[PDB]
Design a protein around this ligand. Structure first.
Ligand code: HEM
Ligand code: HEM
Lengths: 362, 361
């Protein structure tokens, strides 16, 4: 239940160990005054320093003047930090404002249309986002609510997504979680310890072209519905064929252990692992950090389930795009549908107590 | 780590409150009494497996490659996580299978209450399964697999995820706070109070419905909070609405949370004052609800609130009088009841040969 440090060269919440719960929100900016927006960023950074340490924002949740609303809404009182991280990102549409056009990064590429895409524009896009991750879902909701509260009149929430449980791993020494299809998810990811792999595949460099993004990353979010009725009547062999790993151990087909290296030629030509593997993609590698969700029924007598997929990479054009292009023939496509999409530039870390979110851009 | 499944009562009522909830209401699609009893027996077998941390049937893997696995497998490698599974029967169940005359009188239809805004789609249900656990994935896997086993005989009508405390970081003796920032649960029936459970919670034989002896009656209300409006109210307005201060949760005029309230020092329409048993002829409830946050609606607003669950010996003498007395609650300014259901929760599964609903069928 400890705290994750808030300051660093990079923002926490990426290479950090994946916490149990997600509350992700996308925001549209509603002010034209760039000075007001910078003031917002400074105030949000100050709140996040309190929040990530387990402190109430402002002057606290009670004890102030009776006739004023309290600074902090109060529902996280007496809770530990719970490994809360807060990660902010800037959407492509933001750079149409405040005179930022010339500063939008080349690596903040718009996604092309992919086959099967059925994207809902209400749950897509966003001028910016905040990814709140914690082991306690009340801690995460409290942080989103209080950021939105502070930004009233300058930002509004466009759409949000709660993940009730992780389906990713940055800690290969810990148990790999399973997604709602019942398969381990996260075996061959990037570990928060693999410093060289993060430099090569995740962190933006100065040489890459955009100096203010040095130390940041780029985020692709995809809301993906699962056809669980269809999946749940498929045979065990069909399910294992679709992925290329067995269901129980999660081992590559033909091998004994989850972490044995896959031998791709033994997998079906349309197996998900075979098609997603860096070797099939010229070395393209992603940091996967997604969460499972369920949002009630579908109105047709079934549960509604899916995966809120999040990938961090050094450059959307050499990471998510080529891999997703190679999944056009994926056998998994029969059982899923992408229904929400958004990309963000995640800026560098807040260096110390005088720094603030987005300072290198603004 | 696990909660015993068998008992004179079903678990998940008086047993310790777990961190997470997945509540599902089901509608019945079969007219065949025999087919329904068959499913009740199949569900009970699955509940025994699930609550002990085992896969249903012949497992999540290792069976024939050309068959679908008996268990969908997303709980593999997880612990029992204090999973309890509690089943209830809705009044509409008793229009089927010839059971009309077996409906308990204590399973009363709720009156319409001032300010109700009930979504038909997220109300009612032929039956329900309350799945409580410290791991949300354990709870979801339980609902997911019972619905699968029942496919063809029942459909899921509506489902609600909820959270309370996170036990792995919050002390056990600490009152949780609801999403309005106030401690919630201070004056409640505790599972340790066997005499209050007999008086206020468990159905007795002389209550008039023998098959329900050892059962209870459940009211579910999905209560939206108007978060953004609440958060612009002054600290003094918030405390006036409840009759307790926000920091400590002490009744006005006292200094400790568990000090007994002086009701005359609260505002006349304070929530505690109107809800208290002394203002309702002694009517007392076991509250066992969970917070929810489902996302954000079309106007940018937080879709969040309290999934209110109350157990009582008779709906007519528990939930109805108290909710009636809330007609003028100052809290009504900030909440809206948007979903509702009632259920008869049968007595417990006595042993390995017993099954859910055996006393009724
Ligand atoms: C509901 C949607 C998806 C599900 C259920 C799913 C599931 C899985 C599973 C079970 C594995 C094997 C274990 C592992 O190494 O993590 C895996 C691997 C992987 N997946 Fe997916 N996946 C989904 C979507 C995606 C998408 C959209 C992408 C990229 C656009 C992707 C990229 C990858 C990659 C890169 C690997 C690692 C393969 C390797 O390097 O060995 N997945 N996925
Ligand atoms: C969003 C909806 C509600 C919220 C946030 C809420 C909150 C609270 C709070 C903070 C307390 C004081 C602490 C405690 O004793 O638990 C309380 C007490 C109580 N509430 Fe509510 N409540 C809600 C709805 C209801 C409803 C619908 C009922 C019953 C119809 C109810 C019945 C009670 C009772 C019986 C008490 C105990 C009073 C006593 O004996 O001191 N509440 N509630």
């Amino acid at each position: 239940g400890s705290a994750v440090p808030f300051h660093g060269a990079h923002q926490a919440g990426i290479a950090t160990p994946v916490q149990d719960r997600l509350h992700f929100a996308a925001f549209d900016v509603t002010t034209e005054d760039r000075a007001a927006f910078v003031a917002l960023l400074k105030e949000w950074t100050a709140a996040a320093r309190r929040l990530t340490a387990g402190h109430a924002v402002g002057e606290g949740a009670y004890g102030g003047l009776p006739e004023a609303p309290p600074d902090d809404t109060g529902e996280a009182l007496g809770l530990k930090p719970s490994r809360l991280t807060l990660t902010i990102g800037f959407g492509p549409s933001l750079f149409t404002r405040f005179g930022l056009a010339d500063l939008r990064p080349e690596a903040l590429a718009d996604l092309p249309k992919f086959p099967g895409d059925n994207l809902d524009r209400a749950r897509s896009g966003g001028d910016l986002c905040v990814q709140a991750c914690a082991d306690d879902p009340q801690v995460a909701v409290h942080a989103i609510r209080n950021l939105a509260r502070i930004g009233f009149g300058k930002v509004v929430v466009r759409w949000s997504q709660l993940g009730f449980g992780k389906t990713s791993s940055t800690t290969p020494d810990k148990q790999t979680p399973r997604n709602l299809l019942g398969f381990k998810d996260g075996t061959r990811n990037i570990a928060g310890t693999e410093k060289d792999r993060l430099d090569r595949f995740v962190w933006a460099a100065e040489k890459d072209g955009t100096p203010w993004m040095t130390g940041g990353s780029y985020l692709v979010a995809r809301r993906i519905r699962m056809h669980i009725e269809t999946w749940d009547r498929a045979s065990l062999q069909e399910q294992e064929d679709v992925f290329g790993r067995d269901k129980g151990e999660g081992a590559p087909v033909g091998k004994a252990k989850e972490r044995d290296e896959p031998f791709l030629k033994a997998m079906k030509p349309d197996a998900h692992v075979r098609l997603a593997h860096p070797d099939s993609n010229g070395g393209a590698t992603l940091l996967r950090r997604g969460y499972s969700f369920t949002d009630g029924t579908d109105g047709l007598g079934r549960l509604d389930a899916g995966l809120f997929f999040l990938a961090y990479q050094r450059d959307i054009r050499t990471g998510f795009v080529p891999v997703q292009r190679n999944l056009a023939t994926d056998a998994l496509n029969e059982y899923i549908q992408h229904v929400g999409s958004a990309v963000f530039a995640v800026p560098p870390g807040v260096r110390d107590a005088d720094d603030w979110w987005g300072s290198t851009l603004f």
